Amino acid sequence: STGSATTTPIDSLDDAYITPVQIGTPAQTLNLDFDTGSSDLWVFSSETTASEVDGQTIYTPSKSTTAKLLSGATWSISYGDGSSSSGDVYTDTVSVGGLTVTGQAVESAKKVSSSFTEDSTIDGLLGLAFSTLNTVSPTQQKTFFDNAKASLDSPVFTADLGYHAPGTYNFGFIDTTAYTGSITYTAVSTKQGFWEWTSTGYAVGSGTFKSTSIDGIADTGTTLLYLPATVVSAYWAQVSGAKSSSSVGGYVFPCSATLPSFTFGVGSARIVIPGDYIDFGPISTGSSSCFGGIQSSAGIGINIFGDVALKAAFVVFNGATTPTLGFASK
Questions:
Q1: Start and end of every Peptidase A1 domain?
Q2: Does residue 147 sit in the same domain as residue 188?
Q3: Which of 14, 33, 35, 88 is catalytic?
Q4: Which domain holds residue 224?
Q5: In DSSP terms, which residues pair with 100 in a beta bridge?
Q6: Is there a single domain that holds both residue 45 and residue 168?
Q7: 92 in active site
Q8: Is residue 35 among the annotated active site residues?
């Protein structure tokens, strides 16, 4: 089997991407944030505290003839941005782009933090990291991809995120028309539960490539590119007037600037992020200070190849017995 679904930016900045997902019988379609940095499929629901729902579409398990309470199971998750959610668990039929999994754990939110409530466009998350990170207790649950894997034509999914435009998540096949050149594959460590890999270096604009190993995660659920402070300083030093602002929370730059590109290495291959992809717009409405799309990871504990980097490539998440990642230009 295969599946193919379009993923759409939630706003004009590509702050996140939503993909329609069918849950239950008859189908209830919710727009979920596919997140290769986490491993829970959770949804706003009929159980979510009413004051914490503000425009989201909810899953109502009582209206699904295939829903079953997973008795005793609870979940609770906290994300790198400080947001969180928690609740109980049902199993139900879940389909993505024509690919159907029966018995998928659908984690129903009883509580969500303010950032989720305030984002009316995201009805929940669909985690695509390794199932060892799934938070369901006392019986840990498998991701959608893990459950689907055996049925897929090939044990892979691909992320083809658009810049200010829709893109595609495919399951079970590699669309050879969706990228240019060849795909370069690189090793993955699953020891932390992430799609963790080592970039071979970077360049700023037309500058020379610096060979240096940068361990990080491929994370579709993170908006920006978070890299070591040395790398990020080298980038922003090429932008007149750019500075790190503690009050804003990262690097800002004059909105009048033209940003240089940023290149990252994948083995001997190179992925070029155009400068425009690094512009996240005014820090507040009407400001002439703009927020940068490359930020320091120093306070995180891990480097994160988020959407800014991933949307410059066609990315293969290879879930074979030895997982690997593939990157191609497009």
A1: 17-328
A2: no
A3: 35
A4: 175-330
A5: 95
A6: yes
A7: no
A8: yes
